[PDB]
Design an enzyme around this catalytic site. Structure first.
Site, mmCIF file in Angstrom:
data_model
loop_
_atom_site.group_PDB
_atom_site.id
_atom_site.type_symbol
_atom_site.label_atom_id
_atom_site.label_comp_id
_atom_site.label_asym_id
_atom_site.label_seq_id
_atom_site.Cartn_x
_atom_site.Cartn_y
_atom_site.Cartn_z
ATOM 1 N N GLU A 195 104.495 63.959 93.390
ATOM 2 C CA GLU A 195 103.842 62.953 92.558
ATOM 3 C C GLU A 195 102.342 63.234 92.515
ATOM 4 O OE1 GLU A 195 104.821 58.860 93.461
ATOM 5 O OE2 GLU A 195 103.072 58.130 92.349
ATOM 6 N N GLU B 22 115.291 54.501 94.065
ATOM 7 C CA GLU B 22 114.891 54.138 95.430
ATOM 8 C C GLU B 22 115.646 53.042 96.189
ATOM 9 O OE1 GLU B 22 110.932 53.690 93.665
ATOM 10 O OE2 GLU B 22 110.131 54.698 95.439
ATOM 11 N N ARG C 117 103.384 48.043 99.152
ATOM 12 C CA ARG C 117 104.813 47.902 98.878
ATOM 13 C C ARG C 117 105.570 47.494 100.142
ATOM 14 N NH1 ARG C 117 108.547 48.480 95.197
ATOM 15 N NH2 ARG C 117 107.188 49.232 93.507
HETATM 16 O O1 LIG Z 1 104.987 51.080 93.237
HETATM 17 C C1 LIG Z 1 105.137 52.293 93.310
HETATM 18 N N1 LIG Z 1 104.117 53.132 92.962
HETATM 19 C C2 LIG Z 1 104.220 54.495 93.026
HETATM 20 O O2 LIG Z 1 103.315 55.271 92.721
HETATM 21 C C3 LIG Z 1 105.538 55.040 93.508
HETATM 22 N N2 LIG Z 1 106.027 56.227 93.709
HETATM 23 C C4 LIG Z 1 107.268 56.134 94.154
HETATM 24 O O3 LIG Z 1 108.017 57.050 94.447
HETATM 25 N N3 LIG Z 1 107.534 54.845 94.220
HETATM 26 C C5 LIG Z 1 106.514 54.132 93.838
HETATM 27 N N4 LIG Z 1 106.317 52.797 93.741
#
Ligand SMILES: O=c1[nH]c(=O)c2[nH]c(=O)[nH]c2[nH]1
Ligand SMILES: Cc1cc2nc3c(=O)[nH]c(=O)nc-3n(C[C@H](O)[C@H](O)[C@H](O)COP(=O)(O)OP(=O)(O)OC[C@H]3O[C@@H](n4cnc5c(N)ncnc54)[C@H](O)[C@@H]3O)c2cc1C
Ligand code: FES
Ligand code: FES
Ligand SMILES: [Ca+2]
Ligand SMILES: [Ca+2]
Lengths: 1291, 98, 49, 49
Positions: free
Chosen positions: A775, A1234, A853
Site C-alpha cells: 500500500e 479483511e 482502527r
Molecule cells: O481504514 C483503513 N485505511 C487504510 O489505509 C487501510 N488499509 C488497509 O489494508 N485497511 C485499511 N483501513
C-alpha cells in the site's frame, strides 16, 4: 567436457559455456525466457519454482520422473536430463487437466504459486496416475500459498483420486489421457548407450567437475581436498546465495554408481551417500510393510523424521549423505543415526575405514571425523534387535537458522525375557552447537528395570546434563528443556506399551488408559469441507453474472504460467539491474562509505546515494522518510543507497563491495524503550464514553492484565518489484510496478525527481499478492529504481529477494495492551479501560490510522456503557511497520476477546453465554457513537451455533478431556464487527474509464489493482450487468495513472465498493448515449447500436466517479460516522493440543459470514478462507525474531512459518449469510477482504481453552488467569501447560 | 503529431480554457486506450476537432472547480485542485465534439 | 510523400487474452487497431495502438 | 518509433513483395531463406489466424 546438454519441454539446449553458479530457475527465465516458473524464496521452501525432471535411469533401464526446486538446481548438474515446466504441459489454447481443474475450482487467486503447485500435482500423476487423497496432499508439502487457504486446491484435485448450489462442476472436467503426455526426448534414449564421461565447467568464479567414477572422485579429493562436494545442492545452494559462501572448485559425484547403491545386509540396509532422501524413504517404507515389526524399530524412527522433512522437490535431490555431513545442530537425521549407532563407511584414495556414529563423529560446529580427502561412501541403517525399541521426536517449530530446535532419537535394549536396561541411548539436536548424546545420564540406567524410578532418574539427569544457560543461543530455554523431558516421557510410556506387547505386562505395568493418547504417532485425519451460499433468483438473466460463482478471469492464464507479473516482462537490451544497500545498525551515524571494492565487480555502473537525488530526499506518507539515508541510519534495513550493474548477480556482488563504517547512537528497539524514552509518533489518541470511576465502583468484579501481540510478515508470494523506463523527453518516465498504490508511487517518484506528476506514469497489471504490504512500502523500491533510470537514461529493474523484502518493508504492528475490566457476577461487563501501544518502526507511515482502527474496534461485538481506550504509536529504530489486512482491527479485537475470556472464567459462566449477553443489539450505538443498523451479527451467531452443533460438541470436548491426560481439546465461538471505509474520509472515492470500440467490445479500467482478490472479475461482472451485455464483451487489461488519476490505494476492503460504483456510473452514461439508438432498434443487437452511435458522431467513452457519502468522525467530539456500514461474521473452531509438545491440531472450523448479497460467492468464500488462514497464522504460527540490537533474524520460510496445506482445519465449513442485501454498496454487496481474518482468533481461544483444561489437571489446582500472548506458538502453549516436567518435579 | 504542431496548439487551447500557464499542461502521446474511435489526423481538421474536444474537457473540469475558486478567489490553482481532491471531486474528464 | 521517417511498427505481444501493444508511426490509430484485431480474430479492446 | 530500445528477445521483420504487375503465384521456395543465420520463419496468407 565443456558443453552442457539437456532438454527443456522437449527442446534441446546446448550450453557451450555453462557457469556453475547458474541455477535452472535463472536459466529458464532469463536465458530461455520461460517465466511461468517463479522465484518465491530461492530457499527451497515455497515451491513457486517447482519443475519436473525426467531422465533415463542408468541403473534401472527405465525412464523416471521427479520434481525439484529450480531455484536450487545448478544447471551443471542437469547434463542429459529432460526438464518440463508449466509451459510444457499445456497452455490456454489447450490446458492440461491439472491446469484446468485448479483454475475452475477457484484454487488460483493471485496466481503466483499456481505454476509450482501445478507441477507438483503434475509430477505426482506422472508417477501415480490414480493417487490416493493422502498422496495428493503430500504432493504439496513443499508448496506454499498465501491467498487461497488451500481448501479449493485440494478439493479440485481430489477429483483425480480413486476416492444446494456448488462452486464448480467436476462433471465438466476434461478426462486425462496419459498417452498424450510429452514424449521422453528420443536423443536422451540414444545417448543412453555411450558411456558417461567426466565433465568440466568453468564459470566466472567457479569450476565444476562432474565425476563419472569413484576413481576420479577420490583422485581429485586426494590432489585437491579443496574440491567442494555437491550432490543435491539443497544446502550448498543456501550457503552460496544467503551466506556469501564461495567454493572456487566443486565436484559433483551424483553419477557415481557406488554412491547410489542400496545393499541389503544381515545387519541392516546400506545406502550410498548420494542416495536421495526420497529413495531412502521408499526403500525403508517397503521394508517396514514386509518385515516383522520387531526388526523395523529404527527404520520407522527414520521414516518419522523424514515424513515432515521438506517436501517432494527437496527430497528428490537431497542426499542422505548430504544431511549427515552438513552436520547441522538441528539435523533430524543425525540424532537418529547416532542413537542407533549406524555404520558409516568413509573412503579416500587408497584408504577405507568404518566408524559407528557417536559423540566423537561431530567434533565441533558443523564438523565431522572426515579427513579433508575423505568422502562419505555409504551409511547402513540397522535392523532392530528383539527387545530393542526406538522412538524419534522433533520440535513443532523452528526460529533460528540452525540452532535451538529440539530433535531426538531414543533407543533401548533389554536383557532377553526381562525389563532390565541393557543399553540406553538418548541423542538430541537443537540442544548445543552439534548433535549430542546424554552420555552422563543413560549409563546410570544400565541394569535398572523400566519403571517409575527410571523415569525420575533419567529426567533428573537430562535436566542437569543438558542444562541450558539462560544466556544460551536460540533462547526458548524453558521450552527446550521441557521438551527433552517430555519426549523422553513419551518414549518411556511407549516402551511400556511395547514391553506390554511382549507379554511383560505383569513386570513393567499396564499403563493408565487415559495416558494412551500421549504415545499416538502422527495420523492424517480425512478432510471434510462444505461451502454454502445463496443461489441467484431463478428470474435472473443467464448473462447477468452478478451473484454467480464466476471463476477469477485470469485463473486459466495463471495455471498455465502465461499470466505476466512484473519480473516476467522481457528486459530491454539496454536494461540495468539495481540492488539496494541497507544499514546493518539499528541507530548510528554514517562516518564513511567506501565503494572501491564495488567498482572492481564486472558490470558495475554506479552507486547511488542521497547526493544523487535531483530534488527532494524527503519521502514517505508523512514526509519523514529519506529516499537514501543521509548522515545517519535509523534501523537495520534502512536504505543507504543502491548499486546499479548489468546483471542482478553483479549488483549483489557489487553491493557486498560497499563498505560502510558507523558510529552507534542510542537505539530504541522495543515498546518499553519507546515508553521509557517518551518516543512516540504524535500525541495520544483516545475514545471515551460514560463514567469510568462510577462503572468500576458498581462492578462486582475487576480484572486487570496485559497482552502482547506479535507482528506479521505479509509474505506475498511475489516480492516487491519495479521496472522504470525513462523516455528521454521532458522528464517522462513509465514504471511497471507490483503495488496497490499507483498514486503515491507516481507522487514519490515525481517529487524525488523534481518533475510534475503529469510526466510520470505508473502501470500495474497485477501483483502476486499484496495484503497491505504494498500500500506504501513498495515505493521504497520504486523511487530508487526510478532514480537509476533517470541517471542512466536506461531502463532499470529490481525485484527483491525474500530476505531483503522481509527486512526492508516492515509488517503488521506488534501491540502491547494493558487492560482493566469491571463486570457483574452475571458476566455483564460494566466498565472497560484499555491502553494500547504499537511498535511503529522508523517512519510514521500508516501507524496512526492503524491505531485509530484498533481503537474503533476495541469493543468488537460488545456494548460497554463506560469505556475508555487510549493509544500511542511507538517511534523506534526498526523497519517501519505498515498496513496489513486488518489494519489494527485484529489487534484491537484480540485484546477485547482476551479480557472477555477472563470475564467468563471469573464468573464461572459459559463463554458463549457471557459473549451473547454482552453483544450489541440492533440500533445500539458503539463507543464512538455510530448507530448499528442492519445488525446481522445475531443471525450469524445463532446460525453458527446451530449449524456447527456447538452445544453437543462442547459435551464431546468435556468427555475427551476427562478421558485424556496428556491431550486436551478446546472449542470456542468468536464473533466480529468490522467497520468498512477508510478512516481517512476523502480516501473513500473511486474512478473508472470505459470505452466502447466500434466492434462493440468494451475496454474498462478503474483505480483498483488486482492482487488476487478478484477485483477485476467483480468489476467485469458489475459492468456486464449495468450494460446488459455478456462479460465476454468486456475486458480489463491493467490499472494506470494515466487512465484514472488520483486513485486511493487498493485497500480497506473497499475497492470493490468504490470502483464498482465508479464503473456503474460510467456504464450508465454510455447507456444514456445509446438510448436513442436502442429505442429505434429495440431487438437490434448491441453491435448495431454501437455502430449507429459511432456513425452518428456520439461519444463512446466516459469516466465514472463515486464518493462514499456522510462520512467523517471527529475524535474531539466523538461524533460523525467513520464507516459506511459494518461487516459481520462468526466462527466456531475446535482444536486438540499436545500437552507434552505444545503442538496442536485444528480439528474443525465453522464460519458464517455476512457479505451482503455477494457479487461472486466463489471469490468471496475464497476471501473468507484466505483471510481466515492468514489469521490462523498470525495467532498461532507466525513469529518474527530480532536480535537485541534490532536486527531481524527471521528472513525466510525456513524460520518464518506461514500456514501450509496441512495447517488448515481438517473440517472447514464456510457459509455466506442468506437474504441480507446491503443497499448502501454496489448491487447490495458488502466488502469481504479483511473482516474474516480476526475470526481465526477462535482457534487461539480454543487453544487457551485446552490449555486451561491441561492446567486444571497438572498445575496448581485453582482456575488462574494464566498469560497467553500471541502468537500462541508451540512454545507458549507448552510453557502454559504447567506440569511435573515444566516444574522439574519428576526430577 | 507529425510535425504540424498539433499538440502545441492543443496545449495552447487547454491553457486558455483552463486559465493556467502552458507549462502546467503536458501531452505525452496518442493512444487508443485513452481516446477511442478517433478519426485519422487528416483533412486539415485535427486542430478544429480536437481543439473543440479539448475545450469541452477543460470546461467540465472548470465547472467542478467552480465552488473552490469561488471560496478562494485569489488562492492558487494548486489550492483549488487539492481542495477538490480532498472533497472527493473527480479531476478527470472526457471531451467530445462533432 | 517522402516523409523523412518511413513507415514503422513495433508490436509487443503480452501473452494474455490476445493482448498486444503496438508503437506505430501512423496518422490512424483506430484503423491500425481494427485491422490488427480483425486479422488476429480478437476484439478491438485487446489491441492498443 | 525506431529510436525505442529493442527488447532482448525482439525480432526483425522484412516484407516480401511481388515483382509482377499481375500474375498467378505458382509456387514459393524458401529453402535458401532457411539457410540464413537467425532465420525464424516466413509468414504467408496461411498463417493469418
Ligand atoms: O481504514 C483503513 N485505511 C487504510 O489505509 C487501510 N488499509 C488497509 O489494508 N485497511 C485499511 N483501513
Ligand atoms: C526447504 C528445506 C527444508 C529442509 N528441512 C530439513 C529438516 O526439517 N530436517 C533436516 O534434518 N534437514 C532439513 N533440510 C536439509 C537437507 O536434508 C540437506 O540439505 C540435504 O539432505 C543435503 O543433501 P544435498 O545432497 O543437497 O547436499 P549438498 O547441499 O550438495 O551438500 C551438503 C554438504 O555435504 C557435503 N557432502 C555431500 N555428499 C557427501 C559425501 N558423499 N561425502 C562427503 N561429503 C559430502 C558437501 O560437501 C557439503 O558440505 C532442509 C532443506 C531445505 C532446502
Ligand atoms: S523459489 Fe524455489 S522454493 Fe521458493
Ligand atoms: S494464489 Fe497462491 S500464493 Fe497467491
Ligand atoms: Ca512486508
Ligand atoms: Ca510506521
Amino acid at each position: 567436457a565443456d558443453e552442457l546438454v539437456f532438454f527443456v519441454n522437449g527442446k534441446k539446449v546446448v550450453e557451450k559455456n555453462a557457469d556453475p553458479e547458474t541455477t535452472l530457475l535463472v536459466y529458464l527465465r532469463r536465458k530461455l525466457g520461460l517465466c511461468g516458473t517463479k522465484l518465491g524464496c530461492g530457499e527451497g521452501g515455497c515451491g513457486a519454482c517447482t519443475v519436473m525432471i525426467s531422465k533415463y535411469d542408468r541403473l534401472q533401464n527405465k525412464i523416471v520422473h521427479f520434481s525439484v526446486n529450480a531455484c536450487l538446481a545448478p544447471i551443471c548438474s542437469l547434463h542429459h536430463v529432460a526438464v518440463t515446466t508449466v509451459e510444457g504441459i499445456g497452455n490456454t489454447q489447450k490446458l492440461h487437466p491439472v491446469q484446468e481443474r485448479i483454475a475452475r475450482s477457484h484454487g488460483s487467486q493471485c496466481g503466483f504459486c499456481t505454476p509450482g503447485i501445478v507441477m507438483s500435482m503434475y509430477t505426482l500423476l506422472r508417477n501415480q496416475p490414480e493417487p490416493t487423497v493422502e498422496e495428493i496432499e503430500n504432493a504439496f508439502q513443499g508448496n506454499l500459498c498465501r491467498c487461497t487457504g488451500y481448501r479449493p486446491i485440494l478439493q479440485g484435485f481430489r477429483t483425480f483420486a480413486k476416492d444446494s448450489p456448488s462452486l464448480f462442476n467436476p462433471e465438466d472436467f476434461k478426462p486425462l489421457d496419459p498417452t498424450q503426455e510429452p514424449i521422453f526426448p528420443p536423443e536422451l534414449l540414444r545417448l543412453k548407450d555411450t558411456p558417461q564421461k567426466k565433465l568440466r565447467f568453468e564459470g566466472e568464479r567457479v569450476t565444476w567437475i562432474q565425476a563419472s567414477t569413484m576413481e576420479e572422485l577420490l583422485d581429485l579429493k586426494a590432489q585437491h581436498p579443496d574440491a567442494k562436494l555437491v550432490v543435491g545442492n539443497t544446502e550448498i545452494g543456501i550457503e552460496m546465495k544467503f551466506k556469501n559462501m564461495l567454493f572456487p572448485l566443486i565436484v559433483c559425484p551424483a553419477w557415481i554408481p557406488e554412491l547410489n547403491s542400496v545393499v541389503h545386509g544381515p545387519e541392516g540396509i546400506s545406502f550410498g551417500a548420494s542416495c536421495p532422501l526420497s529413495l531412502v524413504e521408499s526403500v525403508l517404507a517397503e521394508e517396514i510393510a514386509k518385515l516383522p515389526e520387531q526388526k523395523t524399530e529404527v527404520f520407522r524412527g527414520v521414516m518419522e523424521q523424514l515424513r515432515a522433512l521438506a517436501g517432494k522437490q527437496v527430497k528428490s535431490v537431497a542426499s542422505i549423505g548430504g544431511n549427515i555431513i552438513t552436520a547441522s545442530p538441528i539435523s533430524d537425521l543425525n540424532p537418529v543415526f547416532m542413537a542407533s549407532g549406524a555404520k558409516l563407511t568413509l573412503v579416500s584414495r587408497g584408504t577405507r575405514r568404518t566408524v559407528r556414529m557417536d559423540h566423537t563423529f561431530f567434533p565441533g560446529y558443523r564438523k565431522t571425523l572426515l579427513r579433508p580427502e575423505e568422502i562419505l561412501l555409504s551409511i547402513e541403517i540397522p535392523y532392530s534387535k528383539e527387545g530393542e525399541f526406538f522412538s524419534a521426536f522433533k520440535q513443532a517449530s523452528r526460529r533460528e537458522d540452525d540452532i535451538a530446535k529440539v530433535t531426538s532419537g531414543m533407543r533401548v535394549l533389554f536383557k532377553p525375557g526381562t525389563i532390565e536396561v541393557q543399553e540406553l541411548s538418548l541423542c538430541f539436536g537443537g540442544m548445543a552447537d552439534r548433535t549430542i548424546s546424554a552420555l552422563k545420564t543413560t549409563p546410570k540406567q544400565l541394569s535398572k528395570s523400566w519403571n517409575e524410578e527410571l523415569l525420575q532418574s533419567v529426567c533428573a539427569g537430562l535436566a542437569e546434563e543438558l542444562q541450558l544457560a539462560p544466556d544460551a543461543p536460540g533462547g526458548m530455554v524453558e521450552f527446550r528443556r521441557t521438551l527433552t523431558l517430555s519426549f523422553f516421557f513419551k518414549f518411556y510410556l511407549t516402551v511400556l506399551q511395547k514391553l506390554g506387547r511382549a507379554d511383560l505386562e505383569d513386570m513393567c505395568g499396564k499403563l493408565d488408559p487415559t495416558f494412551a493418547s500421549a504415545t499416538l504417532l502422527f495420523q492424517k485425519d480425512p478432510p471434510a469441507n462444505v461451502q454454502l451460499f445463496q443461489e441467484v433468483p431463478k428470474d435472473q438473466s443467464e448473462e447477468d453474472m452478478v451473484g454467480r460463482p464466476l471463476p477469477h478471469l485470469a485463473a486459466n492464464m495463471q495455471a498455465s504460467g502465461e499470466a505476466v507479473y512484473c519480473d516476467d516482462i522481457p528486459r530491454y537490451e539496454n536494461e540495468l539491474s539495481l540492488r539496494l544497500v541497507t544499514s546493518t545498525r539499528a541507530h548510528a551515524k554514517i562516518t564513511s562509505i567506501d565503494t572501491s571494492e564495488a567498482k572492481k565487480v564486472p558490470g558495475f555502473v554506479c552507486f547511488l546515494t542521497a547526493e544523487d537525488v535531483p530534488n527532494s530526499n524527503a519521502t514517505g506518507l508523512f514526509n519523514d522518510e529519506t529516499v537514501f539515508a543521509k548522515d545517519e541510519v535509523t534501523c537495520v534495513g534502512h536504505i543507504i543507497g543502491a548499486v546499479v550493474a548489468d546483471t542482478p548477480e553483479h549488483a549483489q556482488r557489487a553491493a557486498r563491495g560497499v563498505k560502510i563504517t558507523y558510529e552507534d547512537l542510542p537505539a530504541i528497539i522495543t515498546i518499553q524503550d519507546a515508553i521509557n524514552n517518551n518516543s512516540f509518533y504524535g500525541s495520544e489518541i483516545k475514545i471515551e464514553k460514560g463514567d469510568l470511576k462510577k462503572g468500576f465502583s458498581e462492578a462486582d468484579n475487576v480484572v486487570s492484565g496485559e497482552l502482547y501481540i506479535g507482528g506479521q510478515e505479509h509474505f506475498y508470494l511475489e516480492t516487491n518489484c519495479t521496472i522504470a523506463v525513462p523516455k528521454g523527453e521532458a522528464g517522462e518516465m513509465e514504471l511497471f510496478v507490483s503495488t496497490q498504490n499507483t498514486m503515491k508511487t507516481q507522487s514519490f517518484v515525481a517529487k524525488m525527481l523534481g518533475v510534475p506528476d503529469n510526466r510520470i506514469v505508473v502501470r500495474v497489471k497485477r501483483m502476486g499478492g499484496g495484503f497491505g504490504g504494498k500500500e506504501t512500502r513498495s515505493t521504497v523500491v520504486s523511487t530508487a529504481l526510478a532514480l537509476a533510470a533517470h541517471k542512466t537514461g536506461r531502463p532499470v529493474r529490481c525485484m527483491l529477494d525474500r530476505d531483503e523484502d522481509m527486512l526492508i518493508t516492515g509488517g503488521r504492528h506488534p501491540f502491547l495492551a494493558k487492560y482493566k475490566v469491571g463486570f457483574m457476577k452475571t458476566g455483564t461487563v460494566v466498565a472497560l479501560e484499555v491502553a494500547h501501544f504499537s511498535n511503529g518502526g522508523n517512519t510514521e507511515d500508516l501507524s496512526r490510522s492503524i491505531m485509530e482502527r484498533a481503537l474503533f474496534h476495541m469493543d468488537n461485538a460488545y456494548k460497554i456503557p463506560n469505556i475508555r481506550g487510549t493509544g500511542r504509536i511507538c517511534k523506534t529504530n526498526l523497519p517501519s511497520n505498515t498496513a496489513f489486512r486488518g489494519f489494527g482491527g485484529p489487534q484491537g479485537m484480540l485484546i477485547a476477546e482476551y479480557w472477555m475470556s477472563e470475564v467468563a472464567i471469573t464468573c464461572g459462566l459459559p463463554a458463549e453465554e457471557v459473549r451473547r449477553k454482552n453483544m450489541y443489539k440492533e440500533g445500539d450505538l458503539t463507543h464512538f457513537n455510530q448507530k448499528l443498523e442492519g445488525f446481522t451479527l445475531p443471525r450469524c451467531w445463532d446460525e453458527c451455533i446451530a449449524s456447527s452443533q456447538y452445544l453437543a460438541r462442547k459435551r464431546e470436548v468435556e468427555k475427551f478431556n476427562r478421558e485424556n491426560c496428556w491431550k486436551k481439546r478446546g472449542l470456542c465461538i468468536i464473533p466480529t464487527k468490522f467497520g468498512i471505509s477508510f478512516t481517512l474520509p476523502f480516501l473513500n472515492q473511486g474512478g473508472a474509464l470505459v470505452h466502447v470500440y466500434t466492434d462493440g467490445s468494451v475496454l474498462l479500467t478503474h483505480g483498483g489493482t488486482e492482487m488476487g482478490q478478484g477485483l477485476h472479475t467483480k468489476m467485469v461482472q458489475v459492468a456486464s450487468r449495468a450494460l446488459k451485455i455478456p462479460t465476454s464483451k468486456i475486458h480489463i487489461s491493467e490499472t494506470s495513472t494515466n487512465t484514472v488519476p488520483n486513485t486511493s490505494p487498493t485497500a480497506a476492503s473497499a475497492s470493490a465498493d468504490l470502483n464498482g460504483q465508479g464503473v456503474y456510473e460510467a456504464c450508465q452514461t454510455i447507456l444514456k448515449r445509446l438510448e436513442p439508438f436502442k429505442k429505434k432498434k429495440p431487438t437490434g443487437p448491441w453491435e448495431a447500436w454501437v455502430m449507429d452511435a459511432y456513425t452518428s458522431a456520439v461519444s463512446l467513452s466516459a469516466t465514472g466517479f463515486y464518493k462514499t457519502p456522510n462520512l467523517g468522525y471527529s475524535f474531539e467530539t466523538n461524533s460523525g460516522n467513520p464507516f459506511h456500514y459494518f461487516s459481520y461474521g462468526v466462527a466456531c473452531s475446535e482444536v486438540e493440543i499436545d500437552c507434552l509438545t505444545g503442538d496442536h491440531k485444528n480439528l474443525r472450523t465453522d464460519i458464517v459470514m455476512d457479505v451482503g448479497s455477494s457479487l461472486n460467492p466463489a471469490i468471496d468464500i475464497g476471501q473468507v478462507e484466505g483471510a481466515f488462514v492468514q489469521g490462523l497464522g498470525l495467532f498461532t504460527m507466525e513469529e518474527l525474531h530480532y536480535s537485541p540490537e534490532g536486527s531481524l533474524h527471521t528472513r525466510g520460510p525456513s524460520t518464518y512459518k506461514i500456514p501450509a496445506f496441512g495447517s488448515i482445519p481438517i473440517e472447514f465449513r464456510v457459509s455466506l449469510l442468506r437474504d441480507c442485501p446491503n443497499k448502501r454498496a454496489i448491487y447490495a454487496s458488502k466488502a469481504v477482504g479483511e473482516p474474516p481474518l480476526f475470526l481465526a482468533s477462535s482457534i487461539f481461544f480454543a487453544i487457551k481453552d485446552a490449555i486451561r483444561a491441561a492446567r486444571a489437571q497438572h498445575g496448581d489446582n485453582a482456575k488462574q488467569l494464566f498469560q497467553l500472548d500471541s502468537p500462541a506458538t508451540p512454545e507458549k502453549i507448552r510453557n502454559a501447560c504447567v506440569d511435573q516436567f515444566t516444574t522439574l518435579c519428576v526430577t
